[PDB]
Amino acid sequence: GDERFYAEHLMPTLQGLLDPESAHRLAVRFTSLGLLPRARFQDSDMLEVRVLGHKFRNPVGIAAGFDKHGEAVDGLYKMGFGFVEIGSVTPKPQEGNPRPRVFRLPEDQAVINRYGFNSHGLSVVEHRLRARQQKQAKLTEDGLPLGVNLGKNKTSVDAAEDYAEGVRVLGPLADYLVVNVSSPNTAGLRSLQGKAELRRLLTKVLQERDGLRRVHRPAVLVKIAPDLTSQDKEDIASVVKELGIDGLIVTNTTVSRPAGLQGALRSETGGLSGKPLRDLSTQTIREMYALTQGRVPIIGVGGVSSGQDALEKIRAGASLVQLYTALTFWGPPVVGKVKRELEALLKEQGFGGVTDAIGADHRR
């Protein structure tokens, strides 16, 4: 469980042998088998957060896209994440884009991916989650909630019906659902972020959700891009408040390529994640928090690899944070590292707990 060993030796050597997709698949295998150090870090009460109708024993989650098909959920809690998001899941199975479709930018601590929603489909994931449904109910009660991220098939004619199907099938198995309208890798998907289409889409989603039995009724969150115009952001905030959307996930990967990227593969098509996304994401959180008057829970994600990164997002308005790319460079010890550093920084800055820090920047 040594950060230095994983960061300086183990992870780099494994990356030396395996292309990123092979490495991802192997990581999922290892994780599902529990082949990792069980956490040194025991979660402090300071790290607990209550939001989305749930207790989270720590605010650090695993972002969607690592466990796309719900295969490694328990290994992910063992890794120390306070909550787990699986997906994106599409209604029907689909292969996603041709390989290669994932690229490392080691010099930038960044990744570019164009998976294209490769997915086992709703039915397979439903059965997988059903097999451990009662274990999840206890985990959730214990402060370890589960989120399910919903996508749409490449060849679907009715985007809203794809999401509605997802709500009906995986909604009853989830503590929260994510409407992913921000994947850069599915044609036309991000235009679902525009006002009229979003309102129509989310109205249908919320109706389907409200039609589920009470104990099986998840919160609904919208995951947005970091590449939105100011107009897009205003409109989303407006729709979210008009419809009573439960929360936002901020943000997905960027189609931008910030100046300064050094990686040889920087011009590959796809969404960029990791360090170059970090502050762009933090700023989007800051803006969405203000537009929603601090009343809509935000899960902050984008380039988090340290306690400081996490705290900056929390102070900007995030109630919870996720990471993914940092894990691909630092390995499993990064989770305890982030939690440990976050706790220390909360103390240094005079916060009683994570909850006190949420949106602190806006009250300065």
Ligand X SMILES: Cc1cc2nc3c(=O)[nH]c(=O)nc-3n(C[C@H](O)[C@H](O)[C@H](O)COP(=O)(O)O)c2cc1C
- Any idea which residues carry the catalytic annotation? 183
Among 183, 281, 319, 325, binds ligand ORO (CB under 6 A): 183
Residue 331 interface partner, choices ligand X, ligand ORO, ligand 3XS, none, CB cut-off 5-8 Å depending on type: ligand 3XS
- Taking CA atoms, 245 is separated from 92, 173, 202, 230, in Å, by 26, 19, 8, 20
For position 198 contacting ligand X by CB under 6 A, the verdict is no
Q: Please give the single-letter amino acid code of residue 158.
A: D
Q: What's the burial of 242, exposed, middle or buried (CB within 10 Å: 0-12/13-18/19+)? A: exposed
Among 59, 116, 147, 359, binds ligand ORO (CB under 6 A): 116
Instruction: Mark the breaks in the chain: residue after which each occurs, C to N over 2.5 Å.
Output: none
Residue 282 interface partner, choices ligand ORO, ligand 3XS, ligand X, none, CB cut-off 5-8 Å depending on type: none
| Closer residue to ligand 3XS (CB): 102 or 301 | 102
Residue 181 interface partner, choices ligand 3XS, ligand X, ligand ORO, none, CB cut-off 5-8 Å depending on type: none
Question: Which part of the chain contacts ligand X (CB under 6 A), choosing from 40-48, 162-170, 299-307, 339-347?
Answer: 299-307
Alpha-helical regions (H) of 36-85: 73-78
Binding-site size for ligand X (CB under 6 A) equals 26
For position 332 contacting ligand 3XS by CB under 6 A, the verdict is yes
Q: Select from 48, 38, 42 the least CA-distant residue to 78.
A: 38
Q: How far apart (Å, rounded) are the C-alpha atoms in residues 247 and 199?
A: 15
Is 332 annotated as a binding-site member?
no
Among 36, 39, 68, 190, binds ligand X (CB under 6 A): 68
CB of 271 to ligand 3XS, least distance (A): 12
Is 65 annotated as a binding-site member?
yes
For position 109 contacting ligand X by CB under 6 A, the verdict is no
Q: Select from 31, 164, 185 the least CA-distant residue to 95.
A: 185
Q: Could you please report the per-residue DSSP string of 86-126?
A: EEEE-SS-B--SPSP-EEEEGGGTEEEE-----B-HHHHHH
Residue 359 interface partner, choices ligand X, ligand ORO, ligand 3XS, none, CB cut-off 5-8 Å depending on type: none
Question: Which part of the chain contacts ligand X (CB under 6 A), choosing from 44-52, 282-290, 307-315, 323-331?
Answer: 323-331
SS (H, E, C) 234-257: HHHHHHHHHHCCCEEEECCCECCC
Q: Coil, strand or helix: which one is 67?
A: coil
Q: How far apart (Å, rounded) are the C-alpha atoms in residues 117 and 65?
A: 9
Among 88, 153, 254, 328, binds ligand 3XS (CB under 6 A): 328
Question: Which part of the chain contacts ligand ORO (CB under 6 A), choosing from 50-58, 157-165, 180-188, 352-360?
Answer: 180-188
Residue written as token pair 């809509």: 296
Contacting residues toward ligand X, per CB under 6 A: 63-65, 68, 87-88, 102, 111, 113, 115, 149, 180, 223, 252-253, 273-274, 277, 301-304, 323-326
